[PDB]
Design a protein around this ligand. Structure first.
Ligand SMILES: Nc1ncnc2c1ncn2[C@@H]1O[C@H](COP(=O)(O)OP(=O)(O)OP(=O)(O)O)[C@@H](O)[C@H]1O
Ligand SMILES: Nc1ncnc2c1ncn2[C@@H]1O[C@H](COP(=O)(O)OP(=O)(O)OP(=O)(O)O)[C@@H](O)[C@H]1O
Lengths: 427, 76, 445, 79
């Protein structure tokens, strides 16, 4: 009983003092164990008078659900509705009563019979359950019923309290890869990471530059920490900060920020972990993860020259930069790099960081891929990220031909009582 | 505004000691720039611009001995 | 691009000889009426009109991945098939590069075009430069062009050969000078950046606005909207005025005829009324719209609308409705009215592609009765973007049927389209290691 | 009503109309036996044009019942 354990722990800590004993309290350890055992899951969702859809109840499996359908059959509507539902939970977790995304005026059905739009959802964590309803009526109409957010604020409170007690607490990933994952840049060829700053970022993705910066930082940490060649790094950083202070005594905001950065660098001794999951292990895991999806290439490196860093790939007998790749490997490299970036970043305690929990939504999985790549992408993604839940869409038969019978949902349009309505089915 | 402030110096009857103080401040700024050059591009550019301004002020002070320009006459 | 004393050589009827003869003749006569009525101008115009634009062959050396390779293109349709990383795009950018210099030299002579970027040359040790060559055949007239760039760090120079393009462009400008509504060729390129699609109140439209750039991106969609409403209001102006008078009088005669059907069918007054109706109908048929096909207005607007509706069989009609402060395009799918922002990605892609092609063709050929029969070349990359297999099987034959005099170059990715293409217009790319060096080859089926 | 008001203010013209040509569109005014464009007018004529246009627009919109809307009441201040 997660709810009972949470209530008991809150009651015990509320009428107690000496936060040190609160940390030593077995209730917090039990809560942490219960949270770790629990796995993120979205069991079902109901849609009412949203866009083309007029009435629908959908249930999703534990691992992977794929919607196959023709053009104009509401495939993207399902993803947009799920994104809307997840937005409120994300906002509540990140900040106190943070407003989320609403339902736009044109989202409601165009028929004159409908007066309001509503979305209902349910989330299950092992044994605990919760639900949420979001509504938005039409223009110029009474009975403006409101939305219910008590359940999501309940869920959120547990996570924020757990992260407050333990600074190493993990969090669930929620991300959404839309059609926008493609641009002229294609997610490539568009000051400091500040160590780790947990990102409750928007589910969509627009900028990959962070990836580059973050990587550069991981490489510098890898060289300095595991390969030594730094001596008394903390003392040297403190001396650099002292010289900065002397220069300041002898643009002011920039100098102060640089001094704070020097102090943060000098805090490396304060951090002092050098654990089994060191920087070089993370670097090798990232590189081998990317190379798993690109069998043709041989090795990837980061070359420093002309006071700048660049990425070098080897194909056959010719070395290529990053600008010279095609769109096919640009898409795969960007998507995989961002997904593993978030996994490695939001779970700083696991021995193998690619084992967290989350939910990922992908639209049009088969963009810029030849059939040979289309026959094996889904198995690679499923095997690589085991404890994640995927929701993807596709219309290419080559994608569907290698999918199990229990994971495929087919959309159909059928006219009942003179009105065409969308239905779903299993083979 | 600038024209007025310069005329105030003429009213203040600033001697060569003001030029010496400006030269000392310029030397201190050059020393600080040299120290910062070792182990902030915008800060370096700002320091270079300030040093150029100080050098221009020193040249203006040198030109002041050559009958100056009577900034109070320009103001009037 | 200059004059000569017309060296006799041997008798021939080449387009070049007519061009030189006209240049020699115009250097003597001063009156413009004689020049505008001379038989040499008629010969030059007829020869230029009956000739058909057609790119012949292309060769690539040391450019991007391709090391050395030559292709020959059919005059109506060609398709390249391959996997990722096989240089499908490289050919298209090579053709766009060579066509840019011809585009540039028509606006104003001695104007530069597009060069080779410094990162396109091959990365191998033994390379020194890269080059591209091409050839354009106007029935019996042949031109060629070479573009090249030397690798950075080398100390040996290379130039470009630009005699052919300058000479060909001068013919087009000379014909455009003496003819009121001369046509021009059509060149376009639909890159993979059509995804980005999603004022000062311009009042003047001309055929030289479509020559600003060869590629399609961003503001062309905006201008298409401005152009469309301009067409619609012109139809309204023609719908009013004297066209109403003949509409009303004929309707009155129809009513009178209907009355003759009634009243038990009732010379004299009947003969006079019938004669007046016959005379009015004869007068209206005599006008024949005044300009007939030339008047356009309604016919052009409906031709554009029906052309767009040809690719979307599930829709009924498209309308332009004036809101209180803005204009709106309204569709109707099934039994529900739709807006342009509420369409799926596939229908948006087809809408933009067909609308842009129709706008370009109509703008470039004003004199033709049916503007959809112009000449030119069109390049398309990855035709199967956001399209289900049902639409994949029929897009090609509809594109070829709607515009029958336009050369097409298309690159594809899936076997669904390959099931509906003739064997004479398929080129298949491959990778083969020969003499210890990996290289790309093209094989006919 | 607006067009007739402007025509009444300036009797040296004959008619004003908007013409959609084969490749453009423009406003045409006829005076005597000459056709002129709206953009050939001087600064003074444009100032008078917009002043009378705004005054007429307000008077028409304020008296929707009178047979002749140019017989309203009010006060106008010009500097
Ligand atoms: N308010 C509305 N009322 C009626 N029909 C609507 C409304 N909004 C959208 N539609 C219809 O929904 C259809 C599908 O739109 P939608 O954006 O859901 O595409 P989709 O099929 O999910 O997308 P994709 O092809 O990317 O999978 C459109 O053809 C449109 O006619
Ligand atoms: N300078 C270069 N030297 C060697 N190879 C290069 C160079 N520039 C690009 N390439 C090669 O070009 C290949 C991609 O070429 P290209 O984009 O034409 O192919 P494509 O995948 O068929 O095209 P698209 O997906 O854009 O339609 C890369 O795999 C890379 O090896």
């Amino acid at each position: 009983n997660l709810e009972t354990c949470y209530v008991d722990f809150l009651e015990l800590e509320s009428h107690v003092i000496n936060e040190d004993y609160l940390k030593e309290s077995v209730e917090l350890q039990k809560l942490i164990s219960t949270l770790n055992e629990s796995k993120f899951h979205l069991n079902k969702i109901g849609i009412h008078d949203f866009k083309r859809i007029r009435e629908l109840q959908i249930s999703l499996e534990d691992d992977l659900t794929v919607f196959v359908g023709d053009n104009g059959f509401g495939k993207s509507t399902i993803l947009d509705a799920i994104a809307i539902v997840l937005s409120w939970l994300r906002s509540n977790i990140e900040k106190e009563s943070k407003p989320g995304t609403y339902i736009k005026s044109h989202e409601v059905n165009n028929s004159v019979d409908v007066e309001y739009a509503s979305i209902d959802a349910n989330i299950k964590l092992k044994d605990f359950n919760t639900s949420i309803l979001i509504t938005k009526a039409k223009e110029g109409a009474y009975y403006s019923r409101n939305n219910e957010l008590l359940g999501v604020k309940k869920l959120a409170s547990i996570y924020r309290l757990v992260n407050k007690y333990v600074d190493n607490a993990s969090l669930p990933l929620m991300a959404y890869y839309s059609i926008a994952r493609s641009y002229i840049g294609g997610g490539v060829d568009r000051v400091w990471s500040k160590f780790d700053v947990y990102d409750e970022i928007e589910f969509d993705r627009n900028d990959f530059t962070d990836f580059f910066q973050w990587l550069v930082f991981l490489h510098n940490r890898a060289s300095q920490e595991k390969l030594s060649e730094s001596q008394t790094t903390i003392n040297a950083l403190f001396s650099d900060i002292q010289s900065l202070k002397a220069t300041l005594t002898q643009v002011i905001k920039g100098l102060e920020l640089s001094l704070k950065e020097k102090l943060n660098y000098m805090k490396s001794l304060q951090s002092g972990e050098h654990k089994f999951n060191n920087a070089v292990s993370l670097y090798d895991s990232v590189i081998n993860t990317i190379l798993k999806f690109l069998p043709e290439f041989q090795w990837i490196k980061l070359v420093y020259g002309d006071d700048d860093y660049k990425i070098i790939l080897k194909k056959g007998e010719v070395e290529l930069d990053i600008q010279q790749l095609s769109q096919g490997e640009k898409t795969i490299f960007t998507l995989v790099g961002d997904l593993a970036r978030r996994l490695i970043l939001l779970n700083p305690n696991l021995s193998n960081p690619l084992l967290g929990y989350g939910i990922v939504l992908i639209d049009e999985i088969d963009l810029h891929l030849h059939p040979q790549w289309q026959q094996t992408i889904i198995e690679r993604l499923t095997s690589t990220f085991p404890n994640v839940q995927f929701v993807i869409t596709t219309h290419s038969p080559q994608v569907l031909s290698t999918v199990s019978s229990r994971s495929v949902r087919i959309l159909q349009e059928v006219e009942v009582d003179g009105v065409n309505d969308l239905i779903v089915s299993h083979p | 505004v600038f024209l007025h402030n310069r005329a105030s110096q003429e009213k203040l009857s600033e001697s060569q000691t003001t030029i010496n103080a400006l030269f000392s401040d310029i030397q201190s700024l050059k020393a600080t720039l040299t120290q910062l050059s070792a182990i902030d591009s915008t800060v370096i550019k700002g320091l270079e611009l300030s040093l150029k301004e100080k050098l221009n002020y020193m040249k203006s002070l040198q030109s002041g001995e050559h009958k100056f320009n009577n900034a109070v006459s320009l103001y009037d």
